[PDB]
Amino acid sequence: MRAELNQGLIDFLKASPTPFHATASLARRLEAAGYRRLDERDAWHTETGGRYYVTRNDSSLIAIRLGRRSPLESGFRLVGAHTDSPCLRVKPNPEIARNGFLQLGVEVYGGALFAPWFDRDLSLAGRVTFRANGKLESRLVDFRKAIAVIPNLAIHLNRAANEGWPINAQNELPPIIAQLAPGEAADFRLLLDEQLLREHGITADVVLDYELSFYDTQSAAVVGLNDEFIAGARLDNLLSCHAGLEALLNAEGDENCILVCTDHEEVGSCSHCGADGPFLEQVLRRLLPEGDAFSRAIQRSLLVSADNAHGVHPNYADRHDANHGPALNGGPVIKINSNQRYATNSETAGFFRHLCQDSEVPVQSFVTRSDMGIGPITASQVGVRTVDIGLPTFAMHSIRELAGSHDLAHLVKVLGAFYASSELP
Amino acid sequence: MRAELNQGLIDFLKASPTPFHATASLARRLEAAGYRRLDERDAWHTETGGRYYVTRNDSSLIAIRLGRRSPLESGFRLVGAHTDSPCLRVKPNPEIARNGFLQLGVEVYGGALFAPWFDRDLSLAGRVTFRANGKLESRLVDFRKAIAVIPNLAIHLNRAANEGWPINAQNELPPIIAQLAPGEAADFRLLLDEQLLREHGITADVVLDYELSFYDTQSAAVVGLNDEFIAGARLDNLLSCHAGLEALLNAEGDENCILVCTDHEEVGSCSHCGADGPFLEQVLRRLLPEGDAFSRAIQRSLLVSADNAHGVHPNYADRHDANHGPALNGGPVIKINSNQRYATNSETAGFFRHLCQDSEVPVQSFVTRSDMGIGPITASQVGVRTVDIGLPTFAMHSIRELAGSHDLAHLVKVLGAFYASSELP
Amino acid sequence: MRAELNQGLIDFLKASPTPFHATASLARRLEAAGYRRLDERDAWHTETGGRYYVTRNDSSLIAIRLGRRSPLESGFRLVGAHTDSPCLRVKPNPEIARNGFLQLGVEVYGGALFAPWFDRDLSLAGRVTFRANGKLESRLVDFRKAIAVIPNLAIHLNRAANEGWPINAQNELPPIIAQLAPGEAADFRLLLDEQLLREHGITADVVLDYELSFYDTQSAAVVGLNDEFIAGARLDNLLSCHAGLEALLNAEGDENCILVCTDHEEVGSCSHCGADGPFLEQVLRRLLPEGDAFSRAIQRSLLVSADNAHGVHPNYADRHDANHGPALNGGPVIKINSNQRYATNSETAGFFRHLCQDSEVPVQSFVTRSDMGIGPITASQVGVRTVDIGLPTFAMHSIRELAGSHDLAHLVKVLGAFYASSELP
């Protein structure tokens, strides 16, 4: 059922307010399915038929199904996605006290659209690092309830509001979380300490640092007269993580299947744990002999880089090429850009397109208007052929994005077919 | 305590997506409390101690509680508010069919902030006028389900989105409600016919015209670390309708109490339907003898004109006068403006300020900055002394506004004291 | 003594006018301390307790102390800095003869602030490549004495000078080094030939090419009423090279310690010998077995990326976030940017912050104002966890920068503690 898949997506989104939580949610499903967690510090002893996963920074995840045939001779079938989404992150000395409020200073992470973050019931989640019994450790928190808001200024006090103004992030985006009594101090670290106790039963000696993201408490939901759509934060790109996961868990065949979901894509993938890092490469090498084996394996592999595409928006149709306007619910989009903003080529495109035909999934094509500006990055790190595809969406980088409610099922089906395909060379 | 009043506010907002629904929700409460509906076409026979309400256009409502002393000799204690809120309304020939979608053309009603309407799960409600069995009639509909969305354009296709642009309402605000099959015709009036059957069991011969408002399906909610806040559409001015109602229904004493909630305030009033139409005057005259009575009664009356004020916003604090920055949860604000943008005067202010003190409710003062730019309308109709007050809020005319969670109780308390107050200035 | 450390810094800066000289100065201290130079062309035979260093391009240096425990099981403790600083470099056909002067045409290297280069007594140093007895070779030169000046134009001939104008580098930055007699030719290569003889006793057959940087002859100096400050060119980032070196040479414990100081950071680190090159990676791999060993080692390692931070400047305080304005002499700054302009995360931040606490060194936090723009690069090359820290400074990329005179000692102490720390996983 599309309906079961879509509900599964809504659940996953709800459990995944930050890249740490997305990674943990992926890990829980994998383990329930029998996948064994490996640690990058240990020597591994994997084998044919094994089901494994590994993480790095608790925010990037690689899932591995080793097939019957070795990667050396049959290659890997890889699906790539990303765990991060543009949002607001709490600063390290964040307490702002003004006009009787307590606010938290925020950085903008990734290319967020600012306006939609206003007038939303926000909570806060992510990683907290602390010392307990002279031991340094980390946990995830999620306050869950709506503790914050970034309100708009009344139109009465900003009469040209609808003219547009340059929203200044330093000044306009700090959320209000509380009011302070006369002479009441404010200690955010103390609030985190309370949350650690409440959520984990832990008392910290001291809260040191954290990576906390504001997020919307409004769950994702089906929308539309005929339930055509799905609305929710983080569709870019938890939509693809979830699809890629369902495809891996249900895939037939006995190929070598990889699900790589990396952090830091919204920011250029350049970290210890991003796609422009050697995470993927160092995991794959561990599944092969030394020498030429990795190079040979990779030239028999294909990466399907799954990241949301732009549907043609009816109130802004002129932002698309008239020949390449994807329809929501018209299936996955093959993304082409010969300037290598996407890595797709005629062979990767052709293979995917054929795969969609054999699976009876509709398929679409996108290029940008020629007067407008992980695929290329991972191709360039490990050298693997890549097709960039995505489900068509609107309002990418909003706090609440829109996709087609038929498209997840289309994508799970074709990814399932990819992962089961014994042929690529 | 009044988690009770707040939950009742949340419930009332949910049942009141349009002015028509707000009027119906007010009426259902008043009837539950014993108030009898009069009709403006009939001669009335009212009496001492009687509890009455009347409507006009099904969108404005006046509730009347007649005390023991005649209006002539003890005046009226009036509380004024309004039933309308800025929003988006369906055009009369609305169907727009483009890039495989069905959209509905919309007018902007009142001074709406455009941006917040984007990326929200919208439903649709209001009055439908139709012919059934040869006769003309009206019903309210509320689809309830989230059938519509106005999505943002991806930041990738609008890269200076955050620098601001002038949102064009004709082009960017039509909501998407569906996708159409190739050759599939779109008929909105037919969709209304189905909603009429579904919601009222009525089948129409022909659906003629309607006044339908899009609205947000996310309910109002308490927000903030210590539940300091309430967030929701239509606080302006359903917050005051609800407060006034509660005060009227619970007030002690013996006085002649009026609750006047008019439509069309957000567009200057100036319909048949108020507040500088003659609805209020024509109802009040009917409670008195002919002659000098109305004029005498009105000179012994006071109107407390309740409409939301602007709290000082900490991310935009220079938009207030530093001496006149109301705090959420700081209590009702007395609104002062010498150019009669508010009708408050030293006597109506002083009396209200005194009422708050005796009720132990905190009270605040607002004037605008002297370099920046309902009470006056109704004082100027009828001639009544007026104090303009309001609970302090943020983001007024957004789709989701913010108030203090303590302020509703504060307001109900003082309005109750006003209604029970045997003398005035 | 802070005083001995600071004098050591002043000496090191004086000996290090170019990245080649910085590298040579580091190498001389290391050798005096018993570190043995390895050559990247040779097979290495290193062992526990060994003290080694290697260079690449004579401008990047890696210093290695092998501990008792193998890197495989205890990881590396790495401190990263850079040998290069923004400056002016002589062009390859540089002789400009105009109005009786001889000038040298210059490129701007890195993001130099132009104005401060004017009206300074400059000398010239760096690498010269030549042929002597049919053999190609390189030496360093340093003219030492003040042979050049870039004078300002008199304010009298540029009366709006203080209004600001766009200093054109091609036209305004060539330094004057001499006056030419009527019909005297000018041969810069010949001058270099003389300098080779004078400085090294070498006669070249022909001077081919060179990488020569102008530099300030004014030594670094303590400044301030209470000697609070240190002023000098190249604090960014010879300040960190020097600190990192002192910490390595004095470190207790028996961990695996690395000091990586790379060239070309001011320009994006993208060279044979920069941090975006494989220098570091290829050295570290040589200290480990083949296979998974390097990956495992790296996931037990931590990089402390030490590069100067911005103190809050009292004449420009609004360029900082009010909550994150580091004080000179307030200790090292932990640099955070969730967009990965720094690689620090809650774990690397927390570990460093704790390390400062156990060492009794004050520690500070920096993020940028949210409306403003080697760590991430090396994390992304080798995959290592990284904390970006820096001593707070002013006037970065001037010819004369300012730091706190207490801060070097603070940084040496904490780096010493890092290098001696047996725990990170």
Ligand SMILES: [Zn+2]
């Ligand atoms: Zn994406």
Ligand SMILES: [Zn+2]
């Ligand atoms: Zn994105």
Ligand SMILES: [Zn+2]
């Ligand atoms: Zn209002």
Ligand SMILES: [Zn+2]
């Ligand atoms: Zn209004």
Ligand SMILES: [Zn+2]
């Ligand atoms: Zn630097």
Ligand SMILES: [Zn+2]
């Ligand atoms: Zn620099």
